[PDB]
Ligand binder design. Structure first.
Ligand SMILES: Cc1ncnc(C(=O)N2CCC3(CC2)OC[C@H](C)c2c3c(=O)n3nc(C4=CCOCC4)nc3n2CC(=O)Nc2ccc(C(F)(F)F)cc2Cl)c1O
Ligand SMILES: [Cl-]
Ligand SMILES: [Zn+2]
Length: 419
């Protein structure tokens, strides 16, 4: 089941509701990440989706399941009308609220007859008083701002109508905003977060094929120089990686061991883990961005807010924590769009394939969740099937796989496609 790899597990009624109103059996990890964070954590989201495949469920499902109201702010008039119609046909009361439509629907919206109200930024700008009445009388499950990049003066498609959506978090400080956009740009994501006044927002990014990322899994010997010598070059009587490199290790001890071996080659490298100070980490982080140090030997702590476009190589030195961590970490490779490589150097020895520490966990559902993820992680590494297929099938909507067939079964896809 998909639900075996979701935390927390969707309850029977959440599944029932999904089948009845949307006609789906399962939530994809990103959808569930966004939906659960809206429902339980009431948490602001920036959800980047290259396309609209699986997009609508993220903002439509929560108000429908709680039976309250969801606001969808968008300038894409015709697509809002199409979704308003598909909702109506699914027995989900929905309307396009605008100045012309007001006389017809506004009383029914104030009375709580609608699950999902689509508005323009222009109309929402003029009616902050209304939304507060809906929050007071009904309770707003979420505000979805689509084409959220239009709030950025620095993007390709600016709209003055998005300026005033900065007020939403003043009018409705307890209501979560789900910002949606097709751009993976780090600076546009920064602009969206600032302009919409989002508070510690959840960042997801899906719909992308990432053809420039190559996937390989090889057995590690354990010996650190033998394992990593294939990744090094000899130039100017010294040693270095091909380009900017992150080596992710399962423990704080391994980051010290791996660095200590690369130190013996005078390789431009630096360590990052929890135990180090924030000044030395901000040095390591700033030296990486300015290309002063070529490698960062990292625990899971190094990752969020790197925003470095030209990471050429990610090495998992040891089996990843799980497919979730693995996905987040390799996704940091090749954000410039240029050819990068993602190699896992794994052994069954590795603590992240060691089932004993899950036989410790006395909380049954959480133990049995952790076992399934450790099992899913082993099944990926043990696989002789296409690695790109496994990761897209797990995390991405089934559309993304159709587009990525080109790269798949070719030299540049993965070790298993090279046959
Ligand atoms: C401030 C801040 N706060 C919180 N967290 C982070 C953070 O550290 N991260 C969040 C975002 C992040 C990377 C990690 O994690 C989710 C997925 C992961 C993801 C991410 C990402 O930053 N980007 N950027 C692209 C671009 C697409 C095309 O143009 C260039 C750029 N795509 C993604 N993807 C999808 C992907 O990479 N999906 C895939 C698709 C195929 C494969 C394949 F290799 F299996 F084929 C692997 C992955 Cl991960 C952060 O920085
Ligand atoms: Cl129904
Ligand atoms: Zn492949």
């Amino acid at each position: 089941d998909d639900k075996d790899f979701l935390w927390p597990a969707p309850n029977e009624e959440q599944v029932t509701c999904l089948k009845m109103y949307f006609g789906h059996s399962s939530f994809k990890p990103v959808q569930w990440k966004v939906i659960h964070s809206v429902l339980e954590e009431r948490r602001d989201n920036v959800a980047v989706m290259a396309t609209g495949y699986g997009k609508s469920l993220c903002f439509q499902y929560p108000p429908v399941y709680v039976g309250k109201i969801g606001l969808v702010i968008s300038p894409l008039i015709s697509l809002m009308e199409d979704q308003v119609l598909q909702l109506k046909m699914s027995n989900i009361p929905a309307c396009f609220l605008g100045s012309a439509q007001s006389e017809n629907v506004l009383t029914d919206i104030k009375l709580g007859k609608y699950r999902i109200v689509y508005v323009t930024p222009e109309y929402c700008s003029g009616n902050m008083g209304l939304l507060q009445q809906l929050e007071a009388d009904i309770g707003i499950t979420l505000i979805a701002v689509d084409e959220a990049h239009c709030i950025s003066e620095w993007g390709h498609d600016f709209r003055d109508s998005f300026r005033k959506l900065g007020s939403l978090k003043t009018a409705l400080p307890m209501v979560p905003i789900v910002a949606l956009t097709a751009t993976a740009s780090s600076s546009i994501r920064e602009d969206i977060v600032r302009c919409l006044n989002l508070r510690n927002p959840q960042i997801t990014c899906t719909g992308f094929d990432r053809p420039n990322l190559y996937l390989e899994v090889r057995r590690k010997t354990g010996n650190i120089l033998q394992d990593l010598q294939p990744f090094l070059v000899k130039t100017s009587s010294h040693w270095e990686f091909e380009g900017p490199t992150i080596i992710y290790c399962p423990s704080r001890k391994m980051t010290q061991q791996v660095t200590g071996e690369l130190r013996k080659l005078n390789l431009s490298c630096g360590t990052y883990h929890a135990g180090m100070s924030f000044s030395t980490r901000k040095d390591i982080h700033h030296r990486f961005v300015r290309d002063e140090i070529q490698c960062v030997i990292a625990t899971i702590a190094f990752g969020m807010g790197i925003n470095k476009a030209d990471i050429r190589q990610v090495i998992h030195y040891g089996a990843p924590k799980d497919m979730e961590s693995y996905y987040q970490e390799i996704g940091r490779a090749g954000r410039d769009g240029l050819q990068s490589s993602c190699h896992v150097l794994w052994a069954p020895a590795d603590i992240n394939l060691n089932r004993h520490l899950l036989t410790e966990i006395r909380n049954e559902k959480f133990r049995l969740y952790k076992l399934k993820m450790m099992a899913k992680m082993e099944k990926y590494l043990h696989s002789s099937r296409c690695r790109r297929q496994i990761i897209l099938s797990h995390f991405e909507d089934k559309q993304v796989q159709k587009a990525s067939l080109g790269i798949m079964g070719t030299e540049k896809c993965c070790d298993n496609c090279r046959s």
